[model samples]
Target chain A: REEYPDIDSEVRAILLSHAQNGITISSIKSEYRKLTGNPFPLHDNVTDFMLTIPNVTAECSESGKRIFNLKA
Target chain B: GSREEYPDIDSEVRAILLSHAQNGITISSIKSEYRKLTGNPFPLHDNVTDFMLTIPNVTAECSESGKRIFNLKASLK
Candidate 1:
C-alpha cells in the first residue's frame, strides 16, 4: 500500500504501538531487536520505517532526543 | 539536520575533503574513506544536503561524469 520496503508486520505493529504514546529512538532500536532479533539494516535505522508510516510524527521531547508519536 | 548525535563525523569528513583539495573527493569515496578511518557507517539524517552544507570550507559539485564531489573551498582559489 506504500512505496517503502515492507519489512514485516509485527515490526510495524510494535513500532506504531510505541509510537502511539511516544517512543525514543533508543527504545525503537531495542524494541525492533527484541521482535526481529536483528538491527535495522537501513542507514537511518528504525527512523527509516518510522518516516514511512503516515500520521506517525517525529519530534523532540525534553527527555527524548528524537521522539515519535502518532496523531490521535 | 537531526545530526546532533555523532555530528563530529562532520569534522572528520571536512578534514578528509581538505586533504584532497586539488582533486576533490567523490561522494562514494568519501563514505568508504570514512568507514576505513572511523570504523562506522555514515549515518544518514533527515536533511542529507544540510549535513554536508554545514561543513565549513567545503564546496560540492557534479563533475564532468556527473559524480558528486566535494572539495575544499580554499582550493578552488
Candidate 2:
C-alpha cells in the first residue's frame, strides 16, 4: 500500500550526499525525478521537509532560491 | 546575480579557502573548518565550484575518484 517506500531514507541520503556543498529545491526535485521517474509529490513544502531533519540547515542562493545543507 | 544574500558567509568561506589554498581542500574539510571557526554550521547554499571561479587563480575540479576539490594556481607563488 505504500507508493514510495524509501522516500525518507532516500531524501536523507540525498541531503547527506550533498551535505558539504548544500542542496537546492531544484536539485532535490531533479534527483527525485531521476529516482522515482516522476514528479516530486511535495513541491512548495520542501522547506518544511528540511525542517524535520536534524542538523539540516538552509539559506538563500544569490538568486534568492532556497538551498539546504546537512551539517556534520 | 550576486552574493548579497550571504555576504557574511561569503567572506568567511573566502578567507578559509584562501588559508587552505596550498594543499587544496575538500568541501567537507572546508565546512568542518567553518564550523570550528565560526561555531556555526556552514550556511551558504551556493556551489563551492561556482564560488571558486570568482577568485582569480583558484581552480575547481574532479579529483580523488569523484570528489570535487579547490586548488590555488601555481601563479600565486
Candidate 3:
C-alpha cells in the first residue's frame, strides 16, 4: 500500500490541483499533456494513491472509469 | 462513527482514516502530503480495495498469521 510512483514534483503538483476541484483520470491526462507537452498515462499512479491513502476515495462509473474526490 | 459497524473496507484503509482522526490531519492536508509522496491527489469516494478489484490478474495468498497478501499480475504483451 506504500509503494511510491515515479513522478516529479511538477506532475505531483498538477495532480493535487485537479484533486482539489474533484477530478477524473482523463481530465488529468488532458491537463498533464497541456502542462508538460507529454502524454502521461497516470491511471496507475492515481489508482495507487486513492487505494493507499485513507482520505481519498473515488466513484467508479458504470463505464469502469473513476472520478477521484477528497473526503471532508 | 460506529467502529463496530464500519463497512468491510481494507484494513489499511481503516487504519489510515482512523489515524487521521487521532492525528488531527485534515483531509486536505493528507491529500497534500499524499501528492508530495506519490504523483496523484486523493480521491473521495472509493476505497483501496476498489482499486485492487480493478486489477486484471490478482491472487491472494494467506499467511500463517491469517493475513492475506495479494499478488497482482499483468498480461504480457
Candidate 4:
C-alpha cells in the first residue's frame, strides 16, 4: 500500500532499488508517502525496494561558435 | 460567384486531388506549431530585419597546446 493513490512503476522501482544504499527504508518510504499522500507497505522490505529502481541521467553540450580561445 | 476556393485547375490539379482523396489528411498543420502559431506570416525575413550587425568575424583557435595561429575565420563580405 502506498501513501497516495498514484501508483507509478518508476517510483516503485526507485523505492525498491535504494533498499541497501545505507538510507533507512522507513524514511525513504515516508517521504514517498508524503509526496503521494498515501502509505507504502513495502517500507519494511529493503530487498524489495532494491530490485526495481531506475537510473536517470542528463547529458549537456555547448554550442560551436561559443567554444573559442582568446588572447590579450 | 467568384469563390475561387480552388483556382487554376492545371496548377492546383494535384493539390485538389489530394485534398479530395486523402482520408486522414495530415497537412503538417502543427509540427513545432507553436513556432508559428504564436504569430507572424513572413518568418525569417520579417524577424531578421530587427537584428543588428555586430557579430565578430574571426575567432582564435582554442587549445592549451596551441600557439597564436588564427584558427577560424568567417569569409562573408
Candidate 5:
C-alpha cells in the first residue's frame, strides 16, 4: 500500500467484498468512489489494464478506448 | 506479466498480481479512483495491487497518490 497505507485496509475490503459477486473492474471502480472519498489510481489510459479482468472483453467504443465488457 | 494470450484473463490478473505483490500497492485508491472515472464498482479483493495488474496496458509506477501512471499503445490507433 505505498500509495495510501492509511486507507488501504478499507480499499482491500472493498475489492475483496465484490470479487465474489462477479463484479467487473468497471463496476467495482465506480461503486468504490461512492464508498470512499477518493479517486481511482492515476494512469495514462486504463484500456490495457481494464481488458485483463475475467470475462472482460475489449471493444472500441465511441470513446475510442478499449471499453471493458463484463457481460460480453 | 509480459505477453498477451497467456493462461486467460483471470489467470493473467492473478499472474500480474503475484509478480508485483512486493511492490506495496493499494486497493482502495485503485477502486475509488476507478469508480470515479468509469462509474463502476471494484471487484471483491483487498489486493488493489493485484486488481490493478489485471488491466492490459495499465502500469503502476512511482507516485505519491494511488494513481499509477498508465502507458499503452492504444493511443496510436
Candidate 6:
C-alpha cells in the first residue's frame, strides 16, 4: 500500500479549509493530530506539500515561526 | 557545532544520505547508519535538512504508520 493513502488530498483539504488566513505548520499539525488522533511525522513533507499547492505561500516571522497562508 | 568546525562533514553526511536514498532506505535507518558512520547520534537539524534538499532526486514520503522515509525518485537512472 502507499505510505499515506490520500494524504495529499487530506493535507490539501486541511490547508484549503483555512483559506481565509491560512495556518502555521504547527497549527496544521494540531489539526492533523485531531484528524488522526495519532502522531503524523511528516512535518518537512507537509512543508514541501505546501509549496505544491496552487496558491499557498509561506513566510517566516522575526520570531522564526513559519506561517503558511493559502491565497484565495 | 559550527560548519567551520567540521568543514568536510557536510559533504560526508550528504554522501551518506544519498547512498541510503538510492537504496530506498528510510530516514530512521539512515540516522542509525549515520551514527555508525560518525560515531555520534546528532539529531537531525537544519544542516541535515539542507543537505537532503540538495540531493538531486531524493524526496520524503510518509509511511503508512506515519514514519518519514527518504528515497530516490523512481525515475532516477
Error of 1 at A28 (Å): 39
For A1-72, candidate 3 gives per-residue lDDT tens digits of: 223254454445655677787667777678778876778655555655434443444454434455666556
- Give the fraction of native contacts in model 4: 0.00
CAPRI class assigned to model 5: incorrect
lDDT of 6 by residue, B1-77 (tens): 55655565656656676576555665567678778887776455553433454455555444456555555555524
How would the docking of model 1 be graded? incorrect
- Predicted candidate 3 versus true structure: per-residue lDDT over B1-77, tens digit per residue: 33334433234333334444333333345456455544545443444344443433432223344333333332367
Give the winner by DockQ.
6
Docking quality tier of model 6: incorrect
Stretches off by above 4 angstroms in model 4 are: A1-22, A55-72, B1-77
Could you estimate the TM-score for every candidate? 0.44, 0.43, 0.36, 0.23, 0.28, 0.45
RMSD to the hidden true structure, all candidates: 12.7, 10.9, 16.7, 22.6, 16.7, 10.6
Q: Count the backbone clashes (under 3 Å) in each candidate.
A: 0, 0, 9, 12, 39, 0
Query: For candidate 4, what is the interface RMSD?
Result: 18.7
Work out the iRMS of candidate 2: 11.7
Give residue A10's lDDT in candidate 2 (0 to 100).
73
Best by lDDT: 2
Q: What is candidate 6's DockQ?
A: 0.06
DockQ score, prediction 2: 0.03
Model with the higher DockQ, candidate 2 or 4: 2
Error of 6 at B59 (Å): 22
Model 6, A15-60: lDDT tens digits are 8776457577777878778876766657555555655555555444
Cα lDDT tens digits, model 5, A1-72, are: 356554445544554565444444555567567777667663444544443333343343234333333332
Clashing pairs in 2: none
For candidate 4, give the DockQ: 0.01
User: Roughly what TM-score does model 4 have, to 2 decimal places?
Assistant: 0.23
Model 1, span B1-77: residue lDDT tens: 53576677767887777678799786668778888778887766354433554465554445446555556554232
- Candidate with more favorable, higher TM-score: 3 or 4: 3
